[PDB]
Amino acid sequence: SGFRKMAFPSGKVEGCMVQVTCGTTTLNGLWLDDVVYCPRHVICTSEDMLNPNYEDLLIRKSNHNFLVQAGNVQLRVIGHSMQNCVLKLKVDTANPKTPKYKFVRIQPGQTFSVLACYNGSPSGVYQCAMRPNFTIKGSFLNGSCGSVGFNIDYDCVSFCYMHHMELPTGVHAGTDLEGNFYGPFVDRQTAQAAGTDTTITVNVLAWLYAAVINGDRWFLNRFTTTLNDFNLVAMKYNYEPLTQDHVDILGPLSAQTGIAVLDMCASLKELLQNGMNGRTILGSALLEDEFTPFDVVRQCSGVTF
């Protein structure tokens, strides 16, 4: 028993992290086969970032201007190209530690592990969620850009995120590994506002199921509701609307616990209207939304890699 915010094992990703330097800007790259992926803003100065013309900046860069170092060992850059907001540095050596991998663009509400790095060296790993407004709430200091987010399925690493920037509100924005930003963000030092950060309802319900499975059931009330009635309350409280697709995804947890999804919705409705009254659920005084139904099933069943 017990329920923890749990990251995927990071080994397969550790073996892919390199340092990329373009005169005095250093950040992280991802080395897969004979390509190193990194944020294109590695090529920007101080002043460049206010309104960079990446096309024009990149024309003044040669292969030999991109310093790529894997531990103590320098990689030879034999080509470079720009795909959306990432650079692909083609190196003369295939990463011998390349795992089975996919590039996947994730949906808001989905969770992934981040391997926070500095100077191409891993510092730590943590599990987070793509917020509905396409930000993440990470832990990223200067030099963490190029750190990646990922999921593992058995032996295959699905890379879903590369870190590009901290907004002035201290939340984080980045791209998929095709260099397309999540949400409306652009890789420029400019006024960029996140949309409203709604709570991921389906994840809160998953976590309430995790709570019941792990023995914390005080919030189970004598009530039920309908999707429409529940969603009236969700809307009031800045929760994402719950769909029949979400109900279907919660089916296996509903089956395991014997608690109908709409009964759990009625429990969540009361928690939103009444608060916790100084009580906790799985050691938290707030409704957690960074566990997917798949995370709860995975953790509660003991799936491995």
Add this chain to the structure above:
Amino acid sequence: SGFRKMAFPSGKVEGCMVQVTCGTTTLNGLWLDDVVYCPRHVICTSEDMLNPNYEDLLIRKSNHNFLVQAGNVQLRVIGHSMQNCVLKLKVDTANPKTPKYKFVRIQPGQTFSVLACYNGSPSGVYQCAMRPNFTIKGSFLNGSCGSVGFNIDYDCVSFCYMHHMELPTGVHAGTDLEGNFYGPFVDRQTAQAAGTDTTITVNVLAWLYAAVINGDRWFLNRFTTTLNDFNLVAMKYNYEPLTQDHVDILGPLSAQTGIAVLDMCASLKELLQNGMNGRTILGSALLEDEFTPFDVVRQCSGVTF
């Protein structure tokens, strides 16, 4: 910026996890050089666990009764011995992935990463703390026994924990890698009560410093206190007494932020007496105590491995 519960990168430990089976009991082992370490209760049946005589049970086991599998590949056991509550299975093959490693016995209040495994395969990694009552609050299902806790210093893995058992209260007990239990626990299916779980005061203060560094300062009050006055309040609230050694350990965070340790103690005193009043600190509605001062400095400075 941003502040996350962050685990060490798990790669170095992933390469050491094996499956150990002793007729129909399967759990995890740690393969370092030519030795596999695992909980000695691998040799127990159902009924054995009520009052096992490990000396006597082990005499009926031969090398060939210990099935050790590293991924798909069987390891040849050429010796076995019992050290306290762990078995050392001497195998004919040195683990080629053995990292630089120490065995360290940690102090209550210190944090470490757990690589949760099943059948010798890593499932996930999470950061936790040795509680003052020598339990940990982990995420451990049937088959997770032999999962290890560790810290990394640059390239050296300090193994501090091996998982042995869940108490009937759903908290977790285990040993150092010399097989000595943390706290009073024994590897038997018996009435075992944890002592009082006090809050790790020095860690809460570290986390309040992390909060200030990351911009959440609403709890900074106009007051100071003394160690003795603060400790009167600590005792009331089941906080560990704060010592001058703790104050000294907080020095670098006190220096970074310009907030005197005893001023932060006065902030903590008011939070304990008044509660949060529906406010949050670093996105939490409770006072977090599973970050050490060293964790806060490490995360806030970007130390790598």
